[PDB]
Motif scaffolding. Structure first.
Motif, PDB file in Angstrom:
ATOM      1  N   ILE A 164       0.803  -1.213   0.098  1.00 11.96           N
ATOM      2  CA  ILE A 164       0.158  -0.035  -0.017  1.00 11.96           C
ATOM      3  C   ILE A 164       0.773   1.133  -0.009  1.00 11.96           C
ATOM      4  CG2 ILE A 164      -1.876   1.273   1.170  1.00 11.96           C
ATOM      5  CD1 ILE A 164      -2.843  -1.325   2.314  1.00 11.96           C
ATOM      6  N   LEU A 212      -3.943   4.423  -1.453  1.00 10.59           N
ATOM      7  CA  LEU A 212      -4.535   4.327  -0.066  1.00 10.59           C
ATOM      8  C   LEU A 212      -6.193   3.933  -0.236  1.00 10.59           C
ATOM      9  CD1 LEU A 212      -4.014   3.969   2.819  1.00 10.59           C
ATOM     10  CD2 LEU A 212      -3.927   6.325   2.907  1.00 10.59           C
ATOM     11  N   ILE A 240      -8.390   0.705   0.673  1.00 13.14           N
ATOM     12  CA  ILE A 240      -9.200   0.621   1.839  1.00 13.14           C
ATOM     13  C   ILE A 240     -10.760   0.100   1.367  1.00 13.14           C
ATOM     14  CG2 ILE A 240     -10.498   2.312   3.420  1.00 13.14           C
ATOM     15  CD1 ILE A 240      -7.798   4.080   3.336  1.00 13.14           C
ATOM     16  N   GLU A 241     -11.062   0.515   0.121  1.00 10.27           N
ATOM     17  CA  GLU A 241     -12.560   0.208  -0.105  1.00 10.27           C
ATOM     18  C   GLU A 241     -12.487  -1.387  -0.546  1.00 10.27           C
ATOM     19  OE1 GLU A 241     -15.510   2.556  -0.700  1.00 10.27           O
ATOM     20  OE2 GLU A 241     -14.137   3.324   0.992  1.00 10.27           O
ATOM     21  N   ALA A 277     -10.689  -3.573   0.671  1.00  7.61           N
ATOM     22  CA  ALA A 277     -10.519  -4.580   1.959  1.00  7.61           C
ATOM     23  C   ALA A 277     -12.017  -4.353   2.475  1.00  7.61           C
ATOM     24  CB  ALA A 277      -9.648  -3.624   2.803  1.00  7.61           C
ATOM     25  N   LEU A 278     -12.651  -3.235   2.568  1.00  7.22           N
ATOM     26  CA  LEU A 278     -14.125  -3.282   3.128  1.00  7.22           C
ATOM     27  C   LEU A 278     -15.124  -4.098   2.411  1.00  7.22           C
ATOM     28  CD1 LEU A 278     -14.106   0.657   3.811  1.00  7.22           C
ATOM     29  CD2 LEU A 278     -14.489  -1.052   5.596  1.00  7.22           C
ATOM     30  N   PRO A 331     -14.723  -8.847   3.533  1.00  4.37           N
ATOM     31  CA  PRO A 331     -14.153  -9.092   4.827  1.00  4.37           C
ATOM     32  C   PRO A 331     -13.522 -10.679   4.894  1.00  4.37           C
ATOM     33  CG  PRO A 331     -16.543  -8.314   4.903  1.00  4.37           C
ATOM     34  CD  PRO A 331     -15.989  -8.709   3.434  1.00  4.37           C
ATOM     35  N   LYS A 332     -12.609 -10.789   5.828  1.00  2.00           N
ATOM     36  CA  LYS A 332     -11.880 -12.161   5.709  1.00  2.00           C
ATOM     37  C   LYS A 332     -12.039 -12.564   7.230  1.00  2.00           C
ATOM     38  CE  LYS A 332      -9.184 -11.313   2.046  1.00  2.00           C
ATOM     39  NZ  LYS A 332      -8.070 -10.562   2.340  1.00  2.00           N
ATOM     40  N   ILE A 344      -9.230  -2.215  16.313  1.00  2.00           N
ATOM     41  CA  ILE A 344     -10.821  -2.282  16.550  1.00  2.00           C
ATOM     42  C   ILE A 344     -11.455  -0.931  16.488  1.00  2.00           C
ATOM     43  CG2 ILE A 344     -12.619  -2.692  18.100  1.00  2.00           C
ATOM     44  CD1 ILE A 344     -10.810  -4.903  19.369  1.00  2.00           C
ATOM     45  N   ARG A 373     -19.962   3.159   6.427  1.00  2.00           N
ATOM     46  CA  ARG A 373     -18.835   3.057   5.514  1.00  2.00           C
ATOM     47  C   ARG A 373     -17.880   4.337   5.168  1.00  2.00           C
ATOM     48  NH1 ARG A 373     -18.376  -0.771   0.314  1.00  2.00           N
ATOM     49  NH2 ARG A 373     -16.573   0.498   0.418  1.00  2.00           N
ATOM     50  N   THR A 421     -15.836   5.208   8.106  1.00  2.00           N
ATOM     51  CA  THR A 421     -14.857   3.890   8.424  1.00  2.00           C
ATOM     52  C   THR A 421     -13.933   4.186   7.351  1.00  2.00           C
ATOM     53  OG1 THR A 421     -16.910   2.357   9.472  1.00  2.00           O
ATOM     54  CG2 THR A 421     -14.766   1.517   8.506  1.00  2.00           C
ATOM     55  N   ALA A 422     -14.218   4.262   6.172  1.00  2.00           N
ATOM     56  CA  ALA A 422     -13.009   4.517   5.304  1.00  2.00           C
ATOM     57  C   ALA A 422     -12.182   5.735   5.516  1.00  2.00           C
ATOM     58  CB  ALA A 422     -13.730   4.547   3.805  1.00  2.00           C
ATOM     59  N   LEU A 437      -9.898   4.784   8.469  1.00  3.35           N
ATOM     60  CA  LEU A 437      -8.825   3.751   8.092  1.00  3.35           C
ATOM     61  C   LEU A 437      -7.730   4.503   6.859  1.00  3.35           C
ATOM     62  CD1 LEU A 437     -11.074   0.867   6.963  1.00  3.35           C
ATOM     63  CD2 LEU A 437      -9.482   0.708   8.850  1.00  3.35           C
ATOM     64  N   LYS A 438      -8.097   5.770   6.421  1.00  7.02           N
ATOM     65  CA  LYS A 438      -7.136   6.428   5.751  1.00  7.02           C
ATOM     66  C   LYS A 438      -6.477   7.208   6.748  1.00  7.02           C
ATOM     67  CE  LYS A 438      -6.785   9.697   1.960  1.00  7.02           C
ATOM     68  NZ  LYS A 438      -7.537  10.734   1.277  1.00  7.02           N
ATOM     69  N   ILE A 481      -3.872   4.629   8.522  1.00  7.96           N
ATOM     70  CA  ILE A 481      -2.695   4.109   7.599  1.00  7.96           C
ATOM     71  C   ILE A 481      -1.815   5.217   7.589  1.00  7.96           C
ATOM     72  CG2 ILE A 481      -2.144   3.200   5.479  1.00  7.96           C
ATOM     73  CD1 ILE A 481      -4.641   1.242   5.977  1.00  7.96           C
ATOM     74  N   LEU A 506      -4.117  -4.495   4.132  1.00  8.68           N
ATOM     75  CA  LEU A 506      -4.990  -4.088   5.062  1.00  8.68           C
ATOM     76  C   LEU A 506      -6.079  -5.135   4.795  1.00  8.68           C
ATOM     77  CD1 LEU A 506      -6.760  -2.367   6.615  1.00  8.68           C
ATOM     78  CD2 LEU A 506      -7.312  -0.836   4.908  1.00  8.68           C
ATOM     79  N   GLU A 507      -6.520  -5.673   5.976  1.00 14.01           N
ATOM     80  CA  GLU A 507      -7.758  -6.650   5.909  1.00 14.01           C
ATOM     81  C   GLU A 507      -8.815  -6.315   6.768  1.00 14.01           C
ATOM     82  OE1 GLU A 507      -6.801 -10.868   6.318  1.00 14.01           O
ATOM     83  OE2 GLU A 507      -4.894 -10.740   5.424  1.00 14.01           O
ATOM     84  N   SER A 508      -9.961  -6.501   6.410  1.00 13.15           N
ATOM     85  CA  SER A 508     -11.171  -6.350   7.170  1.00 13.15           C
ATOM     86  C   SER A 508     -11.520  -7.736   7.882  1.00 13.15           C
ATOM     87  CB  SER A 508     -12.281  -5.716   6.482  1.00 13.15           C
ATOM     88  OG  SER A 508     -13.336  -5.562   7.030  1.00 13.15           O
ATOM     89  N   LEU A 509     -12.126  -7.796   9.195  1.00 15.94           N
ATOM     90  CA  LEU A 509     -12.782  -8.801   9.640  1.00 15.94           C
ATOM     91  C   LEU A 509     -14.068  -8.623   9.930  1.00 15.94           C
ATOM     92  CD1 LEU A 509      -9.894  -9.328  12.298  1.00 15.94           C
ATOM     93  CD2 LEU A 509     -10.049 -10.374  10.004  1.00 15.94           C
ATOM     94  N   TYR A 533     -13.648  -4.729  13.254  1.00 23.85           N
ATOM     95  CA  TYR A 533     -11.957  -5.238  13.415  1.00 23.85           C
ATOM     96  C   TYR A 533     -11.459  -4.953  12.080  1.00 23.85           C
ATOM     97  CZ  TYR A 533     -13.740  -7.358  17.894  1.00 23.85           C
ATOM     98  OH  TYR A 533     -13.927  -7.429  19.242  1.00 23.85           O
ATOM     99  N   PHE A 534      -9.980  -4.486  12.344  1.00 23.86           N
ATOM    100  CA  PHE A 534      -9.230  -4.651  10.945  1.00 23.86           C
ATOM    101  C   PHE A 534      -7.969  -5.069  11.440  1.00 23.86           C
ATOM    102  CE2 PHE A 534     -12.625  -1.152  10.413  1.00 23.86           C
ATOM    103  CZ  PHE A 534     -13.273  -1.631   9.114  1.00 23.86           C
TER     104      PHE A 534
END
Ligand code: FES
Ligand SMILES: [K+]
Ligand SMILES: [Mg+2]
Ligand SMILES: [Mg+2]
Ligand SMILES: [Mg+2]
Ligand SMILES: [Mg+2]
Ligand SMILES: [Mg+2]
Ligand SMILES: [Mg+2]
Ligand SMILES: [Mg+2]
Ligand SMILES: [Mg+2]
Ligand SMILES: [Mg+2]
Ligand SMILES: [Mg+2]
Ligand SMILES: [Mg+2]
Ligand SMILES: [Mg+2]
Ligand SMILES: [Mg+2]
Ligand SMILES: [Mg+2]
Lengths: 100, 78, 97, 137, 50, 22, 117, 122, 86, 97, 111
Positions: free
Chosen positions: E18, E23, E27-28, E30-31, E34-35, H8, H14, H17-18, H21-22, H25, H38-41, H62-63
């Motif tokens: 990244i 960036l 980010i979008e 990833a959103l 989900p994992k 967390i 969204r 949230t975005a 996260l910007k 990071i 970057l992962e989201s849970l 959770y990220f």
RNA sequence: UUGUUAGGACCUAAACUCAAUAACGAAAGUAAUUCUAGUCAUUUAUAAUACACGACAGCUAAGACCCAAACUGGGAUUAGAUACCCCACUAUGCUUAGCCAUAAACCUAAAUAAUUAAUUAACAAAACUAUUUGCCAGAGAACUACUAGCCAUAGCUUAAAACUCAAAGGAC
């Protein structure tokens, strides 16, 4: 004259390999109530219980089928210097052998 | 005390792991009993005398020979 | 003290060298015969109850003696008291067990 | 198709209703069973007091205040006040590990209340406050 | 050979790292996806992802 | 072993501490 | 699985400080302890309370509580036979398991030896 | 070294949230970091109620942020994230992948210990 | 305090067997070791005393567990006497 | 001398070593589904290695992961999450009789 | 201080001789494998190797008394920096004083 | 006052389960999580009058204080009870520096390299060889007297004699 080393190498007991979960033929030589004492060709006999099915068939001299587990039941315990042995073998009686 | 291990045990160990014990029951009262596994080891030796050097070749060829003999070998992974 | 006589260990079970057994058995049978030849008393002794009747039957067949029962303390070290003043003790004891 | 010992999960949909009430709504019976006195308080699911009782309020004194039969009487007394206020089903949160821990729940049963579940909230610190020193006897 | 390969792998991986330019887009992504790290084993030691 | 030899030292030390205190 | 006893006792092999300090040597004895006696629980306690409950209302007059008094006898009559039948049969049988005396005699037929023969 | 952030975040829409996260990071980059992934849970219910910035939270997003940074930056990052008002709980750990699943060959059966007491009759 | 209420240490009553629910609740707390913990937290156990107690219990468990093995190991040899009379 | 004498070699029949249910697997704090299989459903307490059946190494990995997960806002502490009450059972324990 | 301190742009000792051979490597990859993204332990492996070249006749050998002395001079200066922040660390104060004494023993044998 | 609070604040103190584990450290000691720093090569044994550490209690200055708690006060018990039991509460246990340097600091077993037969005083945790240092030489007097050193001042380390006895002591 065959040597003892040759006799041991070609012996049925040497061929058996490990005796766990093997199939063998035994002979009932002693019966006490519903307890059958079975000689399967090893050092120690096993003692099984008379099956409910065909109970009358299991008489002395009757050849049966078995699944060996141990040739001798032994185990060292806490504080012991030697293995305690009960002078008995472990096997599961499967049923009579077909004479055929 | 010497652990008693003959060279046949290498072959016998593979046979028991692949096919288990022969469905025919061992008779340890007959001094000249020939089990299913002992016949496998006798044939495996014969092929090895011919000069086959690969263990994989000797194991699958021996299985074929016994199949021709008619012995029922079940490759039981269970 | 048995390791001299053991041929080896076959997957946990000790095997007894039958060559040493044959040599030793030859000596033991040879000694037992000369004792019997000279009219000595031979006593068979065992405490295994599976073979109690067989061992008592053997002694009777040979013409000798068997003691397969509970052994009283002092049977040999106190023989005169237990059996009588002139009791003749065994000249050889064979321990099947 | 079997009964579940585990309680319903708050924030989910369940088919279990008692007197046309969900699990989160059934009033709660708070039993504090100590080694001397067993107190009982019944509250609505909004945490509003409905009944209160204890071995002391019943009239027991000193060592009698800490017997099984004393808590049983206290539970029956708490039931009567709660039954009058309009309570038929109770969730029993039993704090404490004293003698009238079970007896207080048995009195509530004798008093005409229907227990649907039993929770335990006895304080267990995770490492906390040093307890008082051992008594010598 | 091992160290050269390990350096080359990291260079390939650095393509997808990244940066300030990507960036917001990363980010979008990833959103959107989900994992989950959850999975369970049986008495036979077999993973049982749901 | 018993604590008899420790008891002698226990009394010697106790009595000495009170003598120093006096 | 029995806990590990390797590197626990204080011994010349063990480099570190001991973990276990047994009061007595850890050698299996050839006997088992005498199981401490167990007592029963009150029988017909609920039926007794019911009988007594009716008396309190009716000034301890047995006329009102005739039915309850007969229930108290019924529970006692059953329990009376149950204690008689169970002591005569179950206790004598000892079918389920061995007693301390029977167990010790079996443990002595194959005794543990901490000394060389 | 390689560090795995466990961030967390406050439960938000969204767009917000975005934006969070910007901002997050970007701070990692401002501390000399090289963000790797970057992962989201997903948004979920917290295992318990966490109180951050005078607000009690029951739900959070959770990220995970995988990155590289000097050993000196770890402290500065956690300090900054704890001051953010949309961060319920930041936790930096060394990346699990750096540690390797060790190779095993099953449980070795260690026998019952012996020669603890002398062979003296009792 | 910060967790959710009525999830932990909670049992549900089945068809009005309140005693069974209580007996199951206690079996859980005893099996999980909470009962002994609350029992021993009434007064303070000194660190040396705690270590002495844990050494004692571990040695007892080792003995009892091993004693059970010998009992079960010889359980089969307890049968009718085959050689009665000799 | 003798062709039939035994040959020194490693045991051909030697049985394989049993592995734990987590052998050569990655225990992660974020895998709360797997961690929840080794705690109590009612109290949330970690089970001992006589219950989980794990080895020393994997027991410590699970212990270190449950505590990290519980401390980082991933896992509850006082109970098991109701979601994982239906997962496979790998612990030897029965609360019901 | 000492005349030489490894630069932040220097590669770790594992890839010190490997990256130069590779034809082209990105700036980021060089930064990940530099001493900026490494632990202090890695920076000390570079300090030692520099001193072995500048002093030892055969830098390939690390079992010589001269090399063992060089290994302890890096540790001694490392323990001293630790103790400048952690003034009340008694285990590392012992490590510092024990390494100094170990060097004196080795210097005596070398002499 | 009490009970409940899916109410607020506090962040004092201590770290359940895991632990049926036995790891780390020279010893003392050390097990809530995370990150940073960090243990590593002298052949080995062998060191004080030197250097560096050293549970708990205690001292000095400033803070902390949930709970515990010498002392002290009150209640009870007893012939008495300056105790064992109950209640309240302080020094103190915590933090920041400095001091003190003592433990049944004992795993009562110095460290190192072996050996398991040519080998039971007893008991304990089998016997035993070599190497090097330390220490011991009947009991009590005596963890004392005097001396010197020390941040120690009712202290610590160092450590006798007169005199008394024919035993003391260890294991069974
Ligand atoms: S047995 Fe291999 S990791 Fe547990
Ligand atoms: K000690
Ligand atoms: Mg004593
Ligand atoms: Mg005196
Ligand atoms: Mg003792
Ligand atoms: Mg209040
Ligand atoms: Mg509150
Ligand atoms: Mg580090
Ligand atoms: Mg007083
Ligand atoms: Mg105070
Ligand atoms: Mg202090
Ligand atoms: Mg001293
Ligand atoms: Mg100590
Ligand atoms: Mg002193
Ligand atoms: Mg003095
Ligand atoms: Mg002086």
């Amino acid at each position: 004259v065959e040597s003892f080393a040759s006799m041991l190498r070609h012996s049925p007991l040497t061929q058996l390999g490990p005796a766990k979960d093997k199939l063998v033929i035994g002979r009932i030589f002693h019966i006490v109530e519903d307890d059958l004492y079975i000689d399967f060709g090893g050092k120690f006999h096993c003692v099984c219980k008379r099956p409910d099915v065909d109970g009358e068939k299991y008489q002395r001299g009757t050849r049966v089928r078995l699944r060996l587990l141990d040739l001798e039941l032994t185990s060292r315990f806490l504080g012991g210097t030697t293995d305690t042995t009960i002078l008995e073998a472990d096997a599961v009686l499967l049923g009579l052998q077909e004479i055929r | 005390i010497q652990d008693i291990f003959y060279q046949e045990d290498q072959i016998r160990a593979k046979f028991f792991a692949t096919y288990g014990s022969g469905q025919k029951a061992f008779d340890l009262f007959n001094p000249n009993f020939k089990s299913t596994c002992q016949r496998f080891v006798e044939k495996y030796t014969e092929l090895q005398n011919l000069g086959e050097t690969d263990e994989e070749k000797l194991f699958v060829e021996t299985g074929k020979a016994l199949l021709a003999e008619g012995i029922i070998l079940r490759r039981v992974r269970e | 003290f048995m390791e001299p006589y053991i041929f080896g260990n076959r997957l946990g079970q000790d095997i007894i060298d039958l060559d040493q057994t044959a040599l030793n058995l030859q000596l033991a049978l040879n000694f037992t015969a000369h004792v019997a030849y000279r009219k000595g008393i031979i006593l068979f002794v065992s405490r295994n109850r599976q073979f109690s009747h067989l061992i008592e039957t053997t002694a009777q067949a040979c013409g000798e003696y068997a003691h397969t029962r509970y052994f009283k303390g002092g049977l040999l070290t106190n023989a005169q008291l237990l059996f009588g003043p002139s009791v003749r003790l065994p000249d050889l004891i064979i321990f099947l067990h | 198709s079997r009964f579940s010992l585990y309680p319903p999960v708050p924030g989910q949909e369940s088919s279990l209703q008692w007197a046309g009430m969900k699990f989160e709504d059934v009033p709660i019976a708070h039993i504090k069973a100590t080694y001397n006195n067993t107190q009982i308080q019944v509250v609505s699911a909004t945490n509003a007091s409905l009944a209160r009782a204890s071995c002391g309020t019943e009239g027991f004194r000193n060592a009698k205040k800490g017997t099984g039969i004393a808590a049983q009487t206290a539970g029956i007394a708490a039931a009567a006040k709660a039954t009058g206020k309009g309570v038929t089903h109770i969730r029993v949160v039993v704090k404490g590990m004293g003698p009238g821990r079970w007896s207080a729940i048995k009195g509530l049963t004798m008093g005409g209340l229907e227990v649907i579940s039993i929770t335990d909230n006895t304080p267990v610190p995770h490492x906390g406050c040093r307890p008082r020193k051992a008594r010598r006897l | 050979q091992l160290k050269e390969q390990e350096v080359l792998k990291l260079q390939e991986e650095a393509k997808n790292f990244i940066t300030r330019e990507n960036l917001e887009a990363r980010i979008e992504e990833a959103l959107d996806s989900p994992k989950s790290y959850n999975w369970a084993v049986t008495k036979e030691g077999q993973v049982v992802r749901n | 072993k018993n604590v008899l030899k420790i008891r002698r030292r226990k009394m010697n030390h106790h009595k000495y501490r009170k003598l120093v205190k006096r | 699985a029995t806990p590990s006893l390797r590197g626990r006792l204080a011994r010349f092999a063990n480099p570190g400080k001991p973990i276990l300090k047994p009061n007595k040597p850890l050698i299996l004895a050839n006997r088992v302890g005498n199981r401490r006696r167990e007592k029963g629980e009150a029988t017909c306690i609920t039926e007794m309370s019911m009988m007594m409950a009716c008396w309190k209302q009716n000034e301890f007059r047995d006329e009102a509580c005739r039915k309850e008094i007969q229930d108290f006898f019924d529970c006692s009559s059953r329990a009376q036979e149950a204690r008689k039948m169970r002591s005569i049969q179950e206790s004598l049988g000892q079918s389920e398991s061995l007693s301390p005396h029977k167990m010790t005699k079996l443990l002595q037929r194959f005794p543990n030896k901490s000394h060389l023969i | 070294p390689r560090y795995e952030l466990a961030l967390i975040l406050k439960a938000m829409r969204r767009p917000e949230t975005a934006a969070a996260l910007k901002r997050t990071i970007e701070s990692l980059m401002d501390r000399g970091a090289i963000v790797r992934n970057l992962e989201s849970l997903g948004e979920r219910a917290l295992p318990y109620r966490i109180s951050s910035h005078s607000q009690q939270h029951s739900r959070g997003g959770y990220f995970l942020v995988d990155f590289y940074a000097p050993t000196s930056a770890v402290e500065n990052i956690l300090e900054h994230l704890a001051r953010d008002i949309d961060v319920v709980r930041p936790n930096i750990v060394k990346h699990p992948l750096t540690q390797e699943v060790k190779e095993c060959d099953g449980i070795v059966p260690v026998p019952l210990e012996e020669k603890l007491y002398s062979t003296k009759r009792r | 305090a910060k967790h959710l209420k009525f999830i932990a240490r909670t049992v549900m009553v089945q068809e009005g067997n309140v005693e069974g629910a209580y007996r199951t609740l206690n079996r859980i707390l005893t099996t999980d070791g909470l009962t002994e913990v609350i029992s021993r937290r009434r007064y303070y156990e000194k660190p040396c005393r705690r270590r002495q107690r844990e050494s004692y219990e571990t040695c007892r468990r080792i003995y009892n567990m091993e004693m059970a093995r010998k009992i079960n190991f010889l359980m089969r040899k307890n049968r009718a006497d085959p050689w009665l009379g000799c | 001398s003798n062709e039939d004498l035994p040959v020194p070699m490693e045991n051909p029949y030697k049985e394989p070593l049993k592995k734990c249910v987590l052998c050569e697997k990655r225990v992660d704090y974020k895998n709360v589904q797997l961690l929840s299989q080794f705690i109590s459903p009612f109290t949330g307490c970690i089970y001992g290695r006589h219950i989980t059946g794990l080895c020393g190494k994997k027991q410590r990995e699970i212990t270190k992961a449950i505590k990290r997960a519980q401390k980082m806002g991933f896992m509850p502490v006082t109970y098991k999450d109701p979601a994982y009450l239906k997962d496979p059972r790998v612990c030897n324990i029965r609360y019901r009789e | 201080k000492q005349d030489d301190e490894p630069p932040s742009s220097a590669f770790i000792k594992e890839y010190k001789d490997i990256i130069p051979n590779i034809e082209k490597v990105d700036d980021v990859v060089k930064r990940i494998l530099s001493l900026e993204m490494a632990s202090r332990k890695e920076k000390l492996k570079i300090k030692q190797e520099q001193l072995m070249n500048k002093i030892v006749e055969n830098p390939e050998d690390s079992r010589t008394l001269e090399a063992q002395i060089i290994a302890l001079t890096v540790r001694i200066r490392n323990y001293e920096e630790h103790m400048q922040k952690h003034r009340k660390d008694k285990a590392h104060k012992r490590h510092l004083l024990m390494s100094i004494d170990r060097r004196k023993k080795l210097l005596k044998i070398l002499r």
